[PDB]
């Protein structure tokens, strides 16, 4: 299983939604999908998790994950972008059973420009 996270570099104006796609090579019900932000220092920061059919925001519900009818592709939406949303994002997949595994997409960049 490998994950892709595109578009690789996306720009929107402040106030507008931004949508990336997290694409898995296969999906199953026991997977945990994490939506992560990369820190200046390069640490991961959880924005939202998707498991048991539901996306759960960590602290801001502007970060939402929608599963596509496809089932293995997910929209990662940052609704109503702000300037401070700019940065590097990625999705990570977490297997628990029978073997703990973390799989991470490459990062994608979001640039949020001045409100139009």
């Amino acid at each position: 299983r490998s994950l892709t996270f595109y578009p690789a570099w996306l720009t929107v104006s402040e106030g507008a939604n931004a949508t990336f796609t997290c694409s898995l090579s296969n999906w199953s019900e026991d997977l945990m999908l994490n939506w992560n932000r990369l820190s200046p220092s390069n640490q991961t920061e959880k924005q939202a998790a998707f498991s048991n059919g539901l996306s759960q925001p960590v602290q801001d519900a502007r970060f939402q994950i929608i599963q596509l009818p496809n089932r293995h592709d997910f929209h990662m939406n940052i609704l109503d972008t702000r300037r401070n949303d700019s940065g590097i994002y990625l999705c990570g997949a977490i297997s628990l059973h029978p073997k703990a595994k973390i799989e991470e997409s490459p990062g994608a960049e979001l640039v949020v420009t001045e409100r139009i």
Binding site: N34, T44, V58
Partner: protein, 212 residues
């Protein structure tokens, strides 16, 4: 929601040290061991997989058997503490801890390993016992790469030549050798200094020119 915390993203560790790297997670009064899963990893090598109260040695990467362990006793305080003994240059890189206890989250931890240019070997030989030209040599092993500054007994810089290769005894250890060829006298003092960064380190040996 469930998140993991890292007190520090970056550990700088001396070669041959013990190392404890930590990931914190929220825990109330009593810990539910049948729900907790702790997983430490580096470069896809599986270090720790702690499930149902026990470490699963079956899944562990062999070259960690006797040297890596999760500290069971720290888990009650929401601390996932991975301890590696006798840290070597191979042990540098990005580690990931995944904790699942309710929700799940993972963080990255960077280890960088030093090695000090502490053991400096030296050789003093006579090139021509007419001109009194001498060949001075300093060599040491360390990490990262060091340059050598030669200084006279009077604190002036002299032109030496440095060669830099990999070690054979350990691993990515730099082997740094410098030679000073100079005309000199009995009882004269020369200094060779190994200068390395990350963090800064200036280590000096002293060479005295012998008799007859």
């Amino acid at each position: 929601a469930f998140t993991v915390t890292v007190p520090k993203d970056l550990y700088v560790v001396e070669y041959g040290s013990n190392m404890t790297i930590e990931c914190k997670f929220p825990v109330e009064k009593q810990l539910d061991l049948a729900a907790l899963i702790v997983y430490w990893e580096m470069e896809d090598k599986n270090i720790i997989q702690f499930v149902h109260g026990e470490e699963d040695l079956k899944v562990q990467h062999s070259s960690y058997r006797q040297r890596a362990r999760l500290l069971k006793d720290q888990l009650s305080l929401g601390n996932a503490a991975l301890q590696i003994t006798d840290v070597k240059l191979q042990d540098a890189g990005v580690y990931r801890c995944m904790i699942s206890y309710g929700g799940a989250d993972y963080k990255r931890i960077t280890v960088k390993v030093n090695a000090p240019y502490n053991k400096i070997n030296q050789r003093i030989l006579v090139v021509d016992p007419v001109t009194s030209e001498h060949e001075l040599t300093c060599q040491a092993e360390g990490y990262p790469k060091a340059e050598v500054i030669w200084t006279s007994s009077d604190h002036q810089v002299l032109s030496g030549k440095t060669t830099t290769t990999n070690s054979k005894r350990e691993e990515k250890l730099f082997n740094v050798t410098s030679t000073l060829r100079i005309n000199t006298t009995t009882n004269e003092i020369f200094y060779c200094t190994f200068r390395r960064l990350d963090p800064e380190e200036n280590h000096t040996a002293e060479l005295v020119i012998p008799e007859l």
